[PDB]
Amino acid sequence: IVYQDDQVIGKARSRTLEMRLNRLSRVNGHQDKINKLEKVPMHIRRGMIDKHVKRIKKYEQEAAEGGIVLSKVKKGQFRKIESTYKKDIERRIGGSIKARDKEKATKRERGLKISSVGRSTRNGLIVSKRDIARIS
Amino acid sequence: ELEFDRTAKPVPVITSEVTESLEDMIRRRIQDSNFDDLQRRTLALSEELQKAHSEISELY
Amino acid sequence: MLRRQARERREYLYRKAQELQDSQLQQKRQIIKQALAQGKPLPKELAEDESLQKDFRYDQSLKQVDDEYAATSGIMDPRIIVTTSRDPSTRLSQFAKEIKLLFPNAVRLNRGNYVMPNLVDACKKSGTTDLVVLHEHRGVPTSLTISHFPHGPTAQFSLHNVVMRHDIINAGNQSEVNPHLIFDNFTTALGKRVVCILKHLFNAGPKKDSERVITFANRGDFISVRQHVYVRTREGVEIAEVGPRFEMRLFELRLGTLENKDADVEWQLRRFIRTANKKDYL
Amino acid sequence: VRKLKHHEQKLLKKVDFLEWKQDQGHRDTQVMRTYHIQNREDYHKYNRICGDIRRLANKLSLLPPTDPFRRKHEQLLLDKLYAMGVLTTKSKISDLENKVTVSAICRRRLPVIMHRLKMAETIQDAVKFIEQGHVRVGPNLINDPAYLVTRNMEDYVTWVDNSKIKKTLLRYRNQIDDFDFS
């Protein structure tokens, strides 16, 4: 086994040190500060993520061609795979796209309620007979 | 014969019973020989590791 | 010399204040070593700062003799000087010889018309480990200051119950071998400090069957020291007293030498204090 | 150059004749003016070594932490840099990548070390006195102001004898012993 730092050598030892430390900082730290993004502009980062999801959708139909039980991940984030492992691009992409995640998690405002007499159903509005008797 | 407040225990009187309790402590420590003396101050693994060892050695 | 001793005292004192700030970071880096091994919770303030997170990739390669004696702990044998206060009486001239005789690698130079700046410039010149000067009060001795010379700590003591070898009989001659040291009932942080300020006055590495023992008893806030010789009989070790009985207690411990008398007082005896009679090493 | 108006400033957001991305924030002339080094390539000659310390900093860290070859090595390098004077801390080892700096290596030059010993009025007037032939390191005077003085060797930098830079110093103190023609 090559799991500990005393037998493994190279950049993989440095990468497993920061990854084990990041999940330890995940369980208590605030996610707006423990997830820091390396600053890159529009056409580099937008070009980063389309080339990233092109290899992800390449991995998607490969899993569609041969049926394997793939690790199911919600579409707000991508799939953490070997491609992003050797590329070290979690610091420049930020896998959870926080603008699309915010507008999806935020529930929309409903209709402005007015008629506070009964319950809105399929049969229009239904009120109780006690409400009818107390208003008659 | 009034009473008041004092500041510190004096120098302790060296008597027979204090010395023989001290010299019994010396006798017990010599038997165990636990003297707190100042000790006189003394003084191929893996082919990737040796390659990494040689690269840092020439760089030093 | 004088620039050199001023230069290395500046680098030492800054390095003291550097590890004072580093002790919190060393304490915080202890938590990273534990949490990476056993115990998944990582505390709040250490979780955010990524500077410390990149600091530990280097700082994983890090790991007690006193730091003023750390270099010269056992690499060299301490040559030491016993002196008198000023215009010595006959009794402590005998007694400084007995302290010189109790101490291996010790010499006794008389002090008359010297000045303490010019004395410590002379022992910094020729190179010694520490100086032991003795005050007195009409024959019997009262004060004993041990001052380590390469801007080391000084420790001034007060001694009361002094009986000496020249008083009693023509008992013979002292052993003068490298002696065993018996240290007892030192527990406090100043206790471990006063151990290392005094254990280094003897030579390093005495024999396995050295025939004299110098015990230092802490029995009742007075470091009481006697010298003994011994044999190992068929059923029990017998001991016999030789050399001066002392009833000694320290009252100040300055970080500087004895030449300074304005240096950083690491510890001072407090006696006009409501809790001064309560406990020990205070 | 004309403090260009808004309709052309948005068209020209990325233009600057004075500040370019390869110029690394003008840290060359910033530490040059602070510490007063003469020529132009001397900052970068230190940057190759200060980059080489950081190169051996990262290459020490891919190694396992409890490696006995590692356990001997950076403490040997830390003592080398402490005796150099470029880094002034023995506790941390992350300082050998972070605190190793050109400003840490240029304050151990001769004319800055004058200012730390307060022998010169400014950091520039030291360069004037060094170039005129007033300053010695032991027996010999050195005229090149770009001399790194060792942490041990820092103790011995005095003025040269029989000189007018020393006579004024002793005349204020009323101490001139001119048997030694000082």
From Swiss-Prot, chain A:
Coiled coil: none
Compartments reported by the entry: Nucleus, Nucleolus
Function, as annotated: Required for pre-rRNA processing and 40S ribosomal subunit assembly. Seems to act in the processing of 35S rRNA at the A(0), A(1), and A(2) cleavage sites.
Name recorded for this polypeptide: Protein FAF1
Subunit structure as annotated in this protein's UniProt entry: Interacts with KRR1.
Gene (name only): FAF1
Native organism: Saccharomyces cerevisiae (strain ATCC 204508 / S288c)
From Swiss-Prot, chain B:
N-terminal signal peptide: none
Protein purpose: Involved in nucleolar processing of pre-18S ribosomal RNA. Required for the early cleavages at sites A0, A1 and A2 during 18S ribosomal pre-RNA processing.
Protein name: U3 small nucleolar RNA-associated protein MPP10
Assembly description: Component of a heterotrimeric complex containing IMP3, IMP4 and MPP10. Interacts with snoRNA U3. Component of the ribosomal small subunit (SSU) processome composed of at least 40 protein subunits and snoRNA U3. Interacts with the SSU processome subunits EMG1, IMP3, IMP4, KRR1, NOC4/UTP19, NOP1, RPS4A, RPS4B, RPS6A, RPS6B, RPS7A, RPS7B, RPS9A, RPS9B, RPS14A, RPS14B, UTP1-UTP18, UTP20-UTP22 and UTP25.
Family classification: Belongs to the MPP10 family.
Source species, domain of life: Eukaryota
Subcellular location: Nucleus, Nucleolus
First-to-last residue of the parent protein present: 344 to 441 of 593
UniProtKB/Swiss-Prot annotation, chain C:
Protein's cellular compartments: Nucleus, Nucleolus
Disulfide bond positions: none
One cellular component (GO) term of this entry: nucleoplasm
Function: Required for the early cleavages at sites A0, A1 and A2 during 18S ribosomal pre-RNA processing.
Record-level GO BP terms: maturation of SSU-rRNA; ribosomal small subunit biogenesis; rRNA processing
Gene field: IMP4
Consequence of substituting R212A: Loss of RNA binding
Protein name per Swiss-Prot or TrEMBL: U3 small nucleolar ribonucleoprotein protein IMP4
Pfam family, one: Brix
Gene Ontology molecular function terms on file: RNA folding chaperone; rRNA primary transcript binding; single-stranded telomeric DNA binding; snoRNA binding
Oligomeric form and interacting partners: Component of a heterotrimeric complex containing IMP3, IMP4 and MPP10. Interacts with MPP10. Component of the ribosomal small subunit (SSU) processome composed of at least 40 protein subunits and snoRNA U3.
Principal location listed in the UniProt entry: nucleus
Superkingdom, natural source: Eukaryota
Stored PROSITE patterns: BRIX
Keywords for this protein: Nucleus, Ribonucleoprotein, Ribosome biogenesis, rRNA processing
Effect on the protein upon substituting R245A: Loss of RNA binding
Annotated Brix domain residues: 78-259
UniProtKB/Swiss-Prot annotation, chain D:
GO molecular function: RNA folding chaperone; rRNA binding; snoRNA binding
InterPro entries with a match to the protein in the record: Ribosomal_uS4, Ribosomal_uS4_N, S4_RNA-bd, S4_RNA-bd_sf
Keywords: Nucleus, Ribonucleoprotein, Ribosome biogenesis, RNA-binding, rRNA processing, rRNA-binding
Record has Secreted as a keyword: no
Family membership: Belongs to the universal ribosomal protein uS4 family.
Function description: Required for the early cleavages at sites A0, A1 and A2 during 18S ribosomal pre-RNA processing.
UniProt name for this protein: U3 small nucleolar ribonucleoprotein protein IMP3
Species this chain originates from: Saccharomyces cerevisiae (strain ATCC 204508 / S288c) (Baker's yeast)
Organismal lineage: Eukaryota, Fungi, Dikarya, Ascomycota, Saccharomycotina
